[PDB]
Design an enzyme around this catalytic site. Structure first.
Site, PDB file in Angstrom:
ATOM      1  N   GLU C  59       0.649  -1.267   0.089  1.00  0.00           N
ATOM      2  CA  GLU C  59      -0.005   0.110  -0.060  1.00  0.00           C
ATOM      3  C   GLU C  59       1.013   1.483   0.001  1.00  0.00           C
ATOM      4  OE1 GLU C  59      -1.816   1.539   3.501  1.00  0.00           O
ATOM      5  OE2 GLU C  59      -1.895   3.098   2.006  1.00  0.00           O
ATOM      6  N   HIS C  60       2.019   0.922   0.543  1.00  0.00           N
ATOM      7  CA  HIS C  60       3.191   2.456   0.231  1.00  0.00           C
ATOM      8  C   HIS C  60       3.471   2.337  -1.162  1.00  0.00           C
ATOM      9  CE1 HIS C  60       3.582   2.746   4.561  1.00  0.00           C
ATOM     10  NE2 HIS C  60       4.398   3.666   4.522  1.00  0.00           N
ATOM     11  N   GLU C 136       8.032   5.219  10.435  1.00  0.00           N
ATOM     12  CA  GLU C 136       6.667   5.286  10.861  1.00  0.00           C
ATOM     13  C   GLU C 136       6.333   4.479  11.927  1.00  0.00           C
ATOM     14  OE1 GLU C 136       4.677   7.106   9.371  1.00  0.00           O
ATOM     15  OE2 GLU C 136       2.772   6.179  10.265  1.00  0.00           O
TER      16      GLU C 136
END
Ligand SMILES: CCCCCCCCCCCCCCCCCC(=O)OC[C@H](COP(=O)([O-])OCC(O)COP(=O)([O-])OC[C@@H](COC(=O)CCCCCCCCCCCCCCCCC)OC(=O)CCCCCCCCCCCCCCCCC)OC(=O)CCCCCCCCCCCCCCCCC
Ligand SMILES: CCCCCCCC/C=C\CCCCCCCC(=O)OC[C@H](COP(=O)(O)OCCN)OC(=O)CCCCCCC/C=C\CCCCCCCC
Lengths: 106, 418, 445, 49, 47, 57, 54
Positions: C59-60, C136
């Site tokens: 998804e990155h 993150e």
């Protein structure tokens, strides 16, 4: 609510005021009320100058009673100069408690 | 359909309603009040007025307002800016005439009892500390104080020395002078037009006229520095621009989207932002840049906003400011002005899409201009901005007197004269 | 001109299917903007221990290059229209969606089909996103509400794939190669598991034609036709305690097992959580509020904030509350909260249930304001219920609830059960598990 | 004065506690019949004599 | 995100150790050893 | 005529009755936490984390 | 002090033999002990409240 014999009943109210004797200790009528949870909320809603006047009048009467003495008669609270200073604050505190109670049953 | 019914009453009040056929309704009252109308003897009165919407009024106690609104599942909220206050009510369609009577009691007949106002003073300290956990809240209050001498230098939040001292007579004086009928707009979203009018003659009995005559805002070119222990440096650098509702204000809006005003892709590298690409040529640390725009009824501010690390703060601000100079001496492609118009048009139609965004858009039009315009009239004004008007707005910034505000570890941040 | 008449006038959702299995759904509203997206049945509950990071890694990489639009060429044409790209990824779902103008719908559907089919996973964009993910993780460690809700899943579903997190451990992030990511896409990004949804100003006939043109190269029968089947996930009453006295406030969450998505018990259990409520210290009318727990925590200044939750999965769920308070207040917060759960199993009045039904009606229609929340309600109702439940059907399921129904469903789920508990921060006054478990029954009845 | 117990939904609270309170009057009919050995209701059931 | 619960199958009951198909079911037929064993303490201390 | 919120950047605060205090439109603007770490609030006067986005129905 | 002078009457009657004068005096003073506490005292306090206007 009689209109012709409310001169008779004005005299009985004066007689009872003198026979009770908080005026001889220099007290007002609202100084002598019994402090429940309702009256304790009306006390903390008073303006600063009326709260301070009430604390000194009570302290002075408690000091006269320790010594079994009363004030000179020129300093007794008169019947027409007793100010019902606490009565408007107390009616509002009671009116708000009836409203939380009618809401809880309906 | 039924686009909007729009009516001015004979004493200034504006009423506007749209009949959807949606299950929920929304009703808002918009007033010309706010922190620009207080002087130096009553700072912070508008912050306490915002927090006092559920106190005792003449037609309902504070118990009945909280219990009566929660019984039908409704909401009540207050939104403020430096120039406006907005009171909003929403519920389901069958209940809206119950919540209209509550909203007219909060705004047209408040009582400010001593013991209730005194218990509310400690909420001012909680509300301010929550808002100041965001570092941009304090930078933007310091930027308005550096930019103006008065009118537009007053903060949204009460000053610290003043907490505990806002009196009930100051609240009674503010409402009596600023909440009058020629400064008010009543906007409905799921109701009918004759039912709002009969509501309106319930507070047409008093509070007629314009209020008082705030003063013009006077520009001051100043600087406010704030050394602290935050890990990143925030900084802002502006100049005076243009008032709301003029032809130069549209040119400053286009220039904001030429330089860059926030991203469009989640975790994207901002490929069409001019400011972001120029800074990233020589700076390889984490940062963020944006163009800033703020328009008001008689003045405006435009400039840049950076977030950087402390040892790189002067490098970022100089690179960003050098990009605006390139635009002001003619370097501006035609395909860049067109892509900026697309972002400005699409952002305007997406912001009026929900019921909260639409009600806000109609209410601000009725206070400032006294009319309603369709979004097709707005979209024509954006397409009539020429390329020479954008270059002229970048020359007004470069030659104008600057204001600045910064916070963090300011040991490598330039002063506004360097 | 009536709430009943307004629920009939809401436009309907049209659903179609392609030959490869892909479902296409839309709701037309007459307006110049739209939202279009793709919802997938993929998530971390479909991963095992060797590839727990993998779905959050892809998804990155989704917005960073395809074969026809390499690098930042995708980003430049999204921005030159005035449109927005977004994504998210839970434990069971994954989405990618675009918000744009109604005349740019042919371009928007073409970009979404390129993202989910033709996405490049080049080896230099990997080893660059590996660094962005690794810090993150450290940013999420300072959010205390996110740490404590991850602890609650790890202890309620201990030996099961519903216990692992969406992002994965740091040791998996450092080792996920390219062949692990290409194999993840081929197994889960498949036509019978995907929904193409749209809302705003769109016409269904035009959306169907764009789906046939761009989404028909997906193969419709599974490779070596091995079928998935969900292995269920068990609940365990248990507790995890993270002691740290330098944190200024403490976070506690507590849950019993709840019903899954399609259980009809879900509607009376949401009338019940709306009676307990929520609170925060910046609210306006604290001592006068109808919730008993909110009126007490405002008068005595007991907490900063509490909320009730109801989290659903396919077969199991979590039902409970979360609160934030200081170190001297944990024991009184646990006492008053458990006293409200037991007061609803018995003693629940009809006037309470009228307020809890009015709250749930308002929360349903206020969540569907705008094209992005409507499009997300379409895309995940088709993966959860198999259909879109309209608002007139929600309102007839709410009207059936009364006080004896609420009294029955709460005793089934709360009374005499083992909860799961998670805590973080100055938590020395968090009560013992034996004392918490005894609070789940009253010795009267 | 004691019309605090007089509400339209306060007598609803008697309807959900009297099924528990229907029974512990029959614990005294069974618990000190055990304890003090009352010969009255040992005449009752043919289990016990 | 690196913190998982260690395995408890040295202590976990006779049929709930492998985590495949029993969320809230068969809970009544697991808890029926801790509660009617309390009964013959009560009819232990009854007389 | 166009609002404070229509051009992005001047501030607005909100007070509720049953909801939480909010600030501003674009204040915390995106591509700020994309790089580094903008670690977030260590709370001492805890207002909420997700802003009342639940109870969707 | 009507109530104190009624407990003195009941102490005297309790040490007398049971004949004619001490049999009606004894039961008219058992009634007065309950009539003062239960009826006459709560009514007299309300008359006093009304003469002071509360
Ligand atoms: C014998 C068995 C008892 C065992 C004795 C152990 C010792 C007890 C003891 O220490 O003394 C308490 C005990 C009671 O004495 P007291 O009445 O409390 O003394 C007066 C106090 O100052 C109490 O003050 P007082 O108010 O009760 O005095 C009565 C009255 C007036 O009293 C009088 O008539 C004149 C005062 C003379 C002294 C009062 C004592 C007798 C009464 O006072 C007033 O009217 C003034 C009050 C407010 C009116 C406003 C006027 C402004 C002043 O004395 C005894 O020794 C007990 C003997 C039997 C007396 C009680 C039995 C009858 C009831
Ligand atoms: C010792 C005997 C203990 C054996 C049985 C335990 C008896 C009490 C439990 C009954 C209450 C259960 C539901 C009530 C809800 C609740 O949480 O109550 C809190 C609260 C604290 O205890 P619990 O947490 O219930 O106990 C079980 C903890 N695992 O309730 C109480 O029991 C109140 C305390 C009074 C009971 C006293 C403790 C039990 C017996 C006392 C023996 C000596 C202790 C102190 C002396 C008491 C008399 C001198």
């Amino acid at each position: 609510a009689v209109a012709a014999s409310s001169k008779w009943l004005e005299g009985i109210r004066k007689w009872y005021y003198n026979a009770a004797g908080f005026n001889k200790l220099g007290l007002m009528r609202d100084d002598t009320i019994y402090e429940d949870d309702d009256v304790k909320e009306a006390i903390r809603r008073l303006p600063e100058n009326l709260y301070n006047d009430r604390v000194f009048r009570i302290k002075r009467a408690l000091d006269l009673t320790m010594r079994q003495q009363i004030l000179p008669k020129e300093q007794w609270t008169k019947y027409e100069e007793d100010k019902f200073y606490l009565e408007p604050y107390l009616k509002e505190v009671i009116r708000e408690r009836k409203e939380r109670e009618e809401w809880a049953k309906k | 359909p039924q686009d909007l019914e729009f009516t001015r009453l004979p004493n200034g009040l504006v009423i506007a309603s749209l009949e959807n056929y949606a299950p929920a309704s929304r009703i808002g009252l918009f007033i010309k009040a706010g922190s620009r109308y207080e002087d130096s003897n009553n700072l912070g009165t508008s912050h306490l007025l915002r927090l006092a919407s559920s106190l005792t009024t003449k037609g309902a106690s504070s118990f009945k307002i909280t219990r009566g609104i929660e019984a039908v599942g409704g909401k009540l909220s207050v939104t403020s800016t430096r120039e406006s206050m907005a009171y909003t009510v929403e519920c389901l369609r069958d209940d809206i005439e119950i919540l209209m009577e509550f909203l007219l009691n909060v705004t047209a007949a408040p009582e400010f009892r001593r013991w209730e106002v005194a218990a509310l003073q400690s909420q001012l300290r909680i509300d301010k500390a929550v808002a100041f956990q965001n570092p941009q809240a304090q930078v933007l209050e310091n930027l308005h104080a550096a930019a103006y001498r008065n009118a537009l230098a007053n903060s949204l939040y009460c000053p610290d020395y003043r907490i505990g001292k806002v009196t009930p007579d100051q609240l009674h004086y503010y409402v009596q002078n600023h909440f009058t009928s020629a400064r008010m707009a009543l906007i409905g979203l799921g109701v009918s037009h004759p039912v709002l009018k009969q509501v309106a003659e319930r507070f047409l009995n008093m509070r007629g006229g314009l209020g008082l005559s705030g003063a013009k805002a006077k520009y001051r070119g100043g600087e406010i520095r704030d050394q602290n222990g935050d890990s990143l440096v925030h900084a802002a650098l502006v100049a005076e621009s243009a008032a709301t509702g003029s032809a130069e204000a549209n040119a400053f809006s286009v220039l904001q989207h030429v330089l860059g005003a926030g991203p469009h892709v989640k975790r994207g590298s901002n490929a069409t932002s001019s400011l972001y690409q120029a800074v990233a040529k020589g700076v390889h640390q984490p940062f963020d840049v944006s163009a800033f725009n703020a328009s008001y009824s008689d003045s405006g501010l435009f400039g840049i906003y950076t977030i950087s690390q402390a040892a790189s703060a002067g490098d970022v601000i100089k690179s960003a400011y050098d990009q605006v100079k390139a635009i002001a001496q003619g370097n501006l492609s035609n395909t860049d002005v067109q892509a900026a118009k697309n972002k400005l048009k699409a952002g305007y139609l997406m912001s009026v899409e929900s019921s909260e965004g639409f009600l806000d858009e109609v209410g601000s039009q009725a206070l400032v201009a006294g009319s309603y315009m369709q979004p097709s009239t707005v979209l024509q004004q954006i397409d009539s901005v020429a390329d020479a008007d954008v270059i002229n707005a970048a020359k007004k910034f470069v030659s104008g007197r600057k204001s600045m505000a910064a916070s963090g570890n300011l040991g490598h941040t330039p002063f506004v004269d360097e | 001109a009536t709430y009943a008449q307004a629920l009939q006038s809401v436009p309907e959702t049209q659903v179609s299917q392609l030959d490869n299995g892909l479902r296409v759904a839309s709701e037309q509203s007459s307006q110049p903007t739209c939202t279009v997206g793709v919802w997938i049945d993929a998530g971390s509950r479909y991963e095992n221990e060797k590839n727990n990071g993998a779905g959050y890694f892809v998804e990155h990489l989704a917005f960073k290059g395809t074969k026809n639009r390499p690098g930042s060429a995708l980003e430049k044409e999204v921005e030159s229209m005035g449109a927005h790209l977004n994504a998210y990824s839970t434990r069971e779902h994954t989405a990618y969606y675009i918000k744009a103008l109604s005349k740019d719908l042919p371009k928007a559907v073409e970009l979404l089909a390129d993202i989910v089919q033709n996405c490049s996973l080049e080896d230099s964009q990997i080893e660059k996103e590996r660094d962005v993910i690794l810090q993150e993780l450290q940013e999420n460690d300072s959010s205390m509400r996110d740490v404590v809700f991850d602890y609650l899943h790890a202890t309620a579903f201990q030996g099961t794939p519903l216990a692992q997190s969406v992002e994965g451990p740091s040791e998996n992030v450092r080792k996920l190669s390219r062949a692990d990511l290409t194999e993840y896409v081929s197994q889960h990004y498949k036509a019978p598991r995907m929904v193409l949804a749209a809302a705003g100003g769109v016409e269904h006939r035009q959306l169907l034609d764009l789906a046939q043109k761009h989404f028909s190269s997906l193969s419709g029968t599974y490779v070596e036709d091995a079928v998935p089947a969900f292995t269920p996930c068990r609940f365990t009453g248990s507790e995890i305690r993270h002691r740290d006295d330098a944190l200024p406030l403490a976070h506690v969450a507590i849950a019993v097992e709840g019903p899954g998505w399609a259980n009809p018990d879900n509607v009376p259990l949401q009338v019940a959580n709306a009676i307990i409520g929520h609170y925060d210290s910046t609210y306006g009318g604290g001592t006068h509020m109808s919730s008993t727990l909110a009126s007490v925590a405002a008068t005595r200044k007991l907490c900063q904030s509490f909320q009730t939750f109801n989290i659903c999965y396919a077969e199991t769920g979590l039902l409970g509350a979360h609160f934030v308070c200081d170190n001297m207040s944990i024991d009184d917060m646990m006492f008053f909260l458990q006293g409200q759960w037991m007061r609803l199993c018995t003693s629940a009045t009809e006037s309470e249930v009228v307020r809890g039904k009015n709250i749930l009606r308002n929360a349903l229609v206020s969540h569907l304001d705008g094209t992005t929340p409507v499009c997300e309600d379409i895309g995940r109702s088709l993966l959860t219920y198999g259909r879109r439940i309209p608002l007139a059907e929600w309102e007839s399921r709410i009207a059936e609830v009364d006080a004896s129904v609420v009294r029955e469903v709460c005793s089934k789920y709360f009374y005499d059960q083992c909860p799961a508990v998670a805590g973080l921060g100055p938590i020395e006054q968090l009560p013992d598990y034996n004392r918490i478990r005894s609070g789940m029954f009253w010795l009267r009845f | 004065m004691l019309s605090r117990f007089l509400g339209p939904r306060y007598r609803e609270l008697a309807r959900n506690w009297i099924p528990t309170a229907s029974m512990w009057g029959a614990v005294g009919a069974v618990g000190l019949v055990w304890a003090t050995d009352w010969r009255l209701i040992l005449d009752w059931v043919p289990y016990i004599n | 995100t690196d913190i998982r619960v260690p395995d408890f199958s040295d202590y976990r009951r006779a049929e709930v150790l492998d985590s495949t198909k029993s969320s809230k079911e068969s809970s009544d037929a697991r808890k029926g050893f801790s509660y009617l064993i309390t009964a013959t303490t009560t009819v232990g201390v009854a007389y | 005529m166009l609002s404070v919120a229509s051009r992005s950047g001047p501030f607005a605060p909100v007070l509720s009755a049953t909801s939480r205090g909010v600030a501003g439109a674009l204040r915390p603007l995106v591509q700020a936490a994309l790089p580094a770490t903008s670690e977030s609030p260590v709370l001492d006067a805890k207002r909420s984390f997700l802003c009342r986005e639940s109870l969707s129905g | 002090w009507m109530l104190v002078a009624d407990l003195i009457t009941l102490t005297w009657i309790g040490g007398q033999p049971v004949e004619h004068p001490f049999i009606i005096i004894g039961q008219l003073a058992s009634i007065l002990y309950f009539l003062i506490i239960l009826v006459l005292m709560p009514i007299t306090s309300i008359i006093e409240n009304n003469l002071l206007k509360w």
